[PDB]
Design an enzyme around this catalytic site. Structure first.
Site, PDB file in Angstrom:
ATOM      1  N   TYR A  30       0.828  -1.207   0.000  1.00 33.53           N
ATOM      2  CA  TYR A  30       0.000   0.000   0.000  1.00 33.53           C
ATOM      3  C   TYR A  30       0.864   1.260   0.000  1.00 33.53           C
ATOM      4  CZ  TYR A  30      -3.679   3.302   1.164  1.00 33.53           C
ATOM      5  OH  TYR A  30      -4.546   4.368   1.117  1.00 33.53           O
ATOM      6  N   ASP A  85       9.424   2.523  -0.031  1.00 35.84           N
ATOM      7  CA  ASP A  85       8.381   3.204   0.715  1.00 35.84           C
ATOM      8  C   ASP A  85       8.647   2.806   2.163  1.00 35.84           C
ATOM      9  OD1 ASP A  85       6.181   3.998   2.144  1.00 35.84           O
ATOM     10  OD2 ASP A  85       4.704   3.349   0.635  1.00 35.84           O
ATOM     11  N   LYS A 106       4.695   8.968   9.169  1.00 39.29           N
ATOM     12  CA  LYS A 106       4.421   8.559  10.544  1.00 39.29           C
ATOM     13  C   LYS A 106       5.409   9.050  11.609  1.00 39.29           C
ATOM     14  CE  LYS A 106       2.199   4.545   8.435  1.00 39.29           C
ATOM     15  NZ  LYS A 106       0.768   4.478   8.839  1.00 39.29           N
TER      16      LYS A 106
HETATM   17  C1  LIG Z   1       3.820   1.731   3.308  1.00 37.58           C
HETATM   18  C2  LIG Z   1       2.855   2.943   3.342  1.00 37.58           C
HETATM   19  N1  LIG Z   1       3.015   4.022   2.457  1.00 37.58           N
HETATM   20  C3  LIG Z   1       2.155   5.130   2.466  1.00 37.58           C
HETATM   21  C4  LIG Z   1       1.111   5.177   3.373  1.00 37.58           C
HETATM   22  C5  LIG Z   1       0.148   6.390   3.384  1.00 37.58           C
HETATM   23  O1  LIG Z   1       0.170   6.989   4.656  1.00 37.58           O
HETATM   24  P1  LIG Z   1      -0.700   8.202   5.128  1.00 37.58           P
HETATM   25  O2  LIG Z   1      -1.926   7.843   5.792  1.00 37.58           O
HETATM   26  O3  LIG Z   1       0.269   8.929   5.959  1.00 37.58           O
HETATM   27  O4  LIG Z   1      -1.094   8.886   3.767  1.00 37.58           O
HETATM   28  C6  LIG Z   1       0.938   4.078   4.287  1.00 37.58           C
HETATM   29  C7  LIG Z   1      -0.182   4.059   5.314  1.00 37.58           C
HETATM   30  N2  LIG Z   1      -1.339   3.766   4.633  1.00 37.58           N
HETATM   31  C8  LIG Z   1       1.816   2.977   4.257  1.00 37.58           C
HETATM   32  O5  LIG Z   1       1.627   1.943   5.141  1.00 37.58           O
HETATM   33  N1  LIG Z   2      -4.416   3.964   5.270  1.00 38.68           N
HETATM   34  C1  LIG Z   2      -4.252   3.934   6.578  1.00 38.68           C
HETATM   35  C2  LIG Z   2      -3.184   3.147   7.155  1.00 38.68           C
HETATM   36  C3  LIG Z   2      -3.015   3.112   8.520  1.00 38.68           C
HETATM   37  C4  LIG Z   2      -3.903   3.853   9.427  1.00 38.68           C
HETATM   38  C5  LIG Z   2      -4.944   4.627   8.953  1.00 38.68           C
HETATM   39  C6  LIG Z   2      -5.796   5.347   9.910  1.00 38.68           C
HETATM   40  O1  LIG Z   2      -6.760   6.091   9.725  1.00 38.68           O
HETATM   41  O2  LIG Z   2      -5.642   5.309  11.231  1.00 38.68           O
HETATM   42  C7  LIG Z   2      -5.192   4.726   7.433  1.00 38.68           C
END
Ligand SMILES: Cc1ncc(COP(=O)(O)O)c(CN)c1O
Ligand SMILES: Nc1cccc(C(=O)O)c1
Ligand SMILES: Cc1ncc(COP(=O)(O)O)c(CN)c1O
Lengths: 426, 426
Positions: free
Chosen positions: B143, B238, B266
């Site tokens: 993702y 990523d 994060k």
């Molecule tokens: C590997 C990875 N890359 C990108 C993202 C996108 O993160 P965010 O919610 O900060 O857009 C996520 C979390 N969904 C992730 O796990």
């Molecule tokens: N896409 C994604 C990944 C991890 C956490 C969340 C979240 O809203 O807390 C969303």
């Protein structure tokens, strides 16, 4: 003197592209000597060199109640004691969501994101998923975030240096985006007639801020509303800048035209990173987990951003808020135009509530093309001169200016006095 | 009892799609009854009903130092007195940027954004602009945010909710995303052989977290590094989840493979909305205003986010940080696998530093397809049972778990005791 700024910016250029986190900040269209901020409060900003300025950028829209508002700050200090992010639902999301639904006409259901870019990106995907069509119509000079297959002829920092858009995105992906001049209904009708059953809808800034300050001509918004309904297409308002600034309910409330979907940002975050998109319930139902259209966000709806948004909206709900903004901004706007005339410079502009524009051209300005006739070299000298006089304005002729509830009558007068000194030279 | 949560969630469903700001918070695949958080601190989270939990989600990655860390909170209180957003350069951007460059091998120049989604979106556009090619290779189960080209065989929520490639995405754009199973070098070679001179590069999670916890097989990362170089394609990591968690320098540091570009998120925000992307200087030079590739962000590089990131990284730089994480996580992981065996349940998993996985299947799990053989109904009962025992785990079999510096040896033991109670039933 800007010694410390030059020093910090020089170092910044080795660590980050162009030495900034965002293009417009590099001052490329007004000299290339950005000033580095140390702190902001009420209607002022302070240099890393100790210079104080009367701020007309307000961190690009969010600071409508003034910088570091005591009540917003206080509410944030209390909230962070409970943690800055949960990653799970919290009561504050319900509160802000409800407040937004009551405030914005077209919004019956909302989804919080982390920026205007995320919101616009989600709204494009939603337009297509709901209509089953791929083509979108956007206007030249407008900005809706750096959306890959859509970012074309955008305004903001793009038009700041005459930059077009992209690259990166393939020509095939951007073929699902049609462009027409702002305020040109005929051009829009032609695009539909030429693309029967393929237009998902039209997205635009109800009142333009990214190619200078531009108001829609009479019947333009109403016209778009009618043609989109006629072809079962969606009308989408990007009120990231206008939302809660032009009026509590945005441009759609002020001018009486109701879109199907609208994007919000800036003010709704009270200073923190926040975005949102919502509209008719039947459309929002496609958003996951309720529907098939996937869109997620780790920090979406975090308690700190929610707290700041809630407090900001409560302040705006107070008596005389928008009346005060309109009053001081008109005084600022007319004053600027009177001084340009008195000093012999061709100029035009205007304002609606706490949002204004000023172009070095006789105009009038109805679209991006008109806006480009402005004398950019004169704007450059004007901008530097004002900066030296203690007035901080957007470092671009293609960016609307902003006013706040913290700006006083005296701050306005001092700005006019500074404008006379500056324009008398030039 | 979860009376207050049920009440708040019920109301939330009328205001927001699915009643959440993000799909996974939905609890769809585990029962449907999400719990609403009130506050978090150290290694715990508290219910709106008063239930306390030992948290293994850590707001999905950011809380590696523990929730509401005293030093992060203190640094934030002091900083916000100066204002939450400037919209102009500030010294703190220079500080964090420099810290990131020293920490991450492949990063020579950085650009801050507001989320992992924005970072991944920018990095895709950059991959194409730099190579002049349009096709990208991604893996099934990974993702990278919700940018259109990424909504193909996506993991995370889409996986949890059993959703298909998202609607509303033009066939034109999706056609440039090539996929292959994770850990499959041969499939990758075939994609190049079949698309000579069209692959801009490959993007992947160095260690997977969005289709369960999956580690790369021996020579897989090295293999990708070699084939991308061979065809002048880019290797993109990523590390939004892995950055600063697997090691201070991420997976690239830990496993010795250096990509050309990497995305961060994060942890770098310390709890606030933050993202970043950087890599070889020659590539980052295309980012505006230095280069032609446009990408902007109003709240990008705001002082509050920068302050939180800086403080978080300083804490991680302390002695024994990663050793402690590896120690308590291995103890948790092995313990869980010992208990599954002792109670007669087929299971597998593992951990690297403070990141772990646990699947209800004998495995081993090398890819998304393997991960899908897990007994989801058993996971559902396991998850609910643990929740009732005071342990909060990710509401999905396809989400990696997280540990923090605030988790104590005793918290781990209490979690194992709870797991025995739960699995003994099932
Ligand atoms: C590997 C990875 N890359 C990108 C993202 C996108 O993160 P965010 O919610 O900060 O857009 C996520 C979390 N969904 C992730 O796990
Ligand atoms: N896409 C994604 C990944 C991890 C956490 C969340 C979240 O809203 O807390 C969303
Ligand atoms: C009309 C409009 N839409 C979207 C955006 C993107 O905002 P953000 O930086 O918050 O993503 C902007 C900011 N220029 C905007 O003015």
């Amino acid at each position: 003197k800007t010694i410390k700024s030059d020093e910090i910016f020089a170092a910044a250029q080795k660590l980050m592209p162009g030495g900034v986190s965002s293009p417009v900040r590099a001052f490329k269209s007004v000299g290339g000597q950005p000033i580095v901020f140390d702190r902001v409060k009420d209607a002022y900003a302070w240099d890393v060199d100790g210079n104080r300025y009367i701020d007309y950028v307000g961190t690009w829209g969010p600071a409508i109640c003034g910088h570091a508002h005591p009540e917003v700050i206080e509410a944030l200090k209390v909230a962070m004691e409970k943690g800055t992010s949960f990653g799970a639902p919290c009561a504050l999301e319900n509160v802000l969501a409800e407040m937004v639904n009551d405030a914005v006409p077209s919004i019956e259901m909302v989804r919080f994101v982390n920026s205007g870019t995320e919101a616009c990106m989600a709204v494009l995907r939603l337009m297509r998923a709901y209509t089953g069509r791929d083509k979108i119509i956007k206007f030249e000079g407008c900005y809706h975030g750096h959306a890959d297959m859509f970012l074309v002829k955008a305004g903001s920092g793009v038009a700041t240096l005459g930059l077009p858009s992209s690259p990166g995105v393939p020509k095939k992906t951007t073929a699902n985006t049609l462009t027409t001049p702002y305020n040109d209904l005929e051009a829009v009708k032609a695009l539909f007639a030429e693309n029967p059953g393929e237009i998902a809808g039209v997205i635009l800034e109800p009142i333009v801020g990214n190619s200078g300050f531009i108001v829609p001509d009479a019947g333009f918004l109403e016209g778009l509303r009618e043609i989109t309904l006629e072809h079962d297409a969606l009308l989408v308002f990007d009120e990231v800048i206008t939302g809660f600034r032009i009026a509590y309910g945005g441009v759609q409330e002020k001018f009486g035209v109701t879109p199907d979907l609208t994007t919000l940002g800036k003010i709704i975050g009270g200073g923190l990173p926040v975005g949102a998109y919502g509209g008719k319930r039947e459309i929002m139902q496609l958003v996951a987990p309720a529907g098939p259209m996937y869109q997620a966000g780790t920090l979406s709806g975090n308690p700190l951003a929610m707290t700041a948004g809630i407090k900001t909206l409560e302040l705006l709900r107070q008596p005389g808020t928008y009346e005060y903004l309109d009053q001081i901004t008109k005084r600022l706007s007319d004053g600027l135009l009177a001084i340009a005339q008195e000093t012999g410079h061709a100029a035009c502009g205007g304002q609606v509530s706490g949002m204004f524009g000023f172009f070095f051209t006789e105009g009038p300005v109805h679209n991006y093309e008109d806006a480009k006739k402005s004398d950019l070299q004169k704007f450059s000298r004007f901008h530097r001169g004002m900066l030296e006089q203690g007035i901080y304005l957007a470092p671009s002729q293609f960016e609307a200016g902003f006013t706040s509830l913290a700006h006083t009558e005296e701050d306005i007068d001092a700005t006019l006095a500074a404008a006379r000194t500056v324009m008398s030279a030039l």
